[PDB]
Design a protein around this ligand. Structure first.
Ligand SMILES: COc1ccc(Cl)cc1NC(=O)Nc1cncc(O[C@@H](C)CN(C)C)n1
Length: 269
């Protein structure tokens, strides 16, 4: 009964912010490394959809492109979260401002991004907050999706539940979420992946939000992909983006079709 195996040393802090902080934990004996999120409490009108939800959903998640959840521990006010350690870091920092990154890597990250989403959707769960800072990388640069504090089930018992609660991050949020009462969950994550796509192949975000009151979003819908933000994107990938950032969520392309895309299956490039 190897002693001391349950004690973890909080070697350092990996990130700081709203929630509180994420610390790197190292086992006292084995020396394995994990991520520990520290919080306190939040909201109440829908407690099940709070720190408790981030736990319930994580308890269902299991895929090589989704941050592994090890467990939780309460302490009156101190709530510890044991997540997978990703020495790689946030995809965000691998994106040169104004430039982005090499098309190859972008495609590689996008492929893995699709696998996680396919999986999550496969099991009826939507992220609702997909963005470069919620995409971690491990030692081998494998893409891992994290932060399911906004994730919710949209299919239970083979029945789809439409959404109406606005959640996410404005720049990454689909247009039907600001113009409609209710909408389908799945198309909302595709739009976000698309915005992530454009961030990786251009180093910048198109609009502050998908509203007509927003300049660049109007130019986009007008095909002015010249000089503008898409000027830095090659035509193969840009074609795919013409298929993703389609206003009408029902016209918008689906994951299964994205995997059939020309640039998606194009070698290296
Ligand atoms: C703060 O996150 C960082 C920063 C730098 C490095 Cl090298 C690794 C991690 N995270 C992990 O290893 N693991 C992890 C797994 N899930 C969530 C989370 O923290 C989030 C709450 C912070 N951002 C929004 C990802 N961290």
């Amino acid at each position: 009964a190897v002693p001391f195996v349950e004690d973890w040393d909080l070697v350092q802090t990996l990130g700081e912010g709203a929630y509180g902080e994420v610390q790197l934990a190292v086992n006292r004996v084995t020396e394995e490394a994990v991520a520990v999120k520290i919080v306190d409490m939040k909201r109440a009108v829908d407690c099940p959809e709070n720190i408790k939800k981030e736990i319930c959903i994580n308890k269902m998640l299991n895929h090589e492109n989704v941050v592994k959840f090890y467990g939780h521990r309460r302490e009156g006010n101190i709530q510890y979260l044991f997540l997978e350690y990703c020495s790689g870091g946030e995809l965000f920092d691998r994106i040169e401002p104004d430039i982005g990154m090499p098309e190859p890597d972008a495609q590689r990250f996008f492929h893995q991004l699709m696998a996680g989403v396919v999986y999550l959707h496969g099991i009826g769960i939507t992220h609702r907050d997909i963005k470069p800072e919620n995409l971690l990388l491990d030692e081998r640069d494998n893409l891992k999706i994290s932060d399911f504090g906004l994730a919710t089930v949209f299919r239970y018992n083979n029945r789809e539940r439409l959404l109406n609660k606005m959640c996410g991050t404005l720049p990454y949020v689909a247009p039907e979420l600001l113009k409609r009462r209710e909408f389908h969950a799945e198309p909302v994550d595709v739009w976000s992946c698309g915005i992530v796509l454009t961030a990786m192949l251009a180093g910048e975000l198109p609009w502050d939000q998908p509203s007509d009151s927003c300049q660049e979003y109007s130019d986009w819908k007008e095909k002015k992909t010249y000089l503008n933000p898409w000027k830095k994107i090659d035509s193969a990938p840009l074609a795919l983006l013409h298929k993703i950032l389609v206003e009408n969520p029902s016209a918008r392309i689906t994951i299964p079709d994205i995997k059939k895309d020309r640039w998606y299956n194009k070698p290296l490039k």
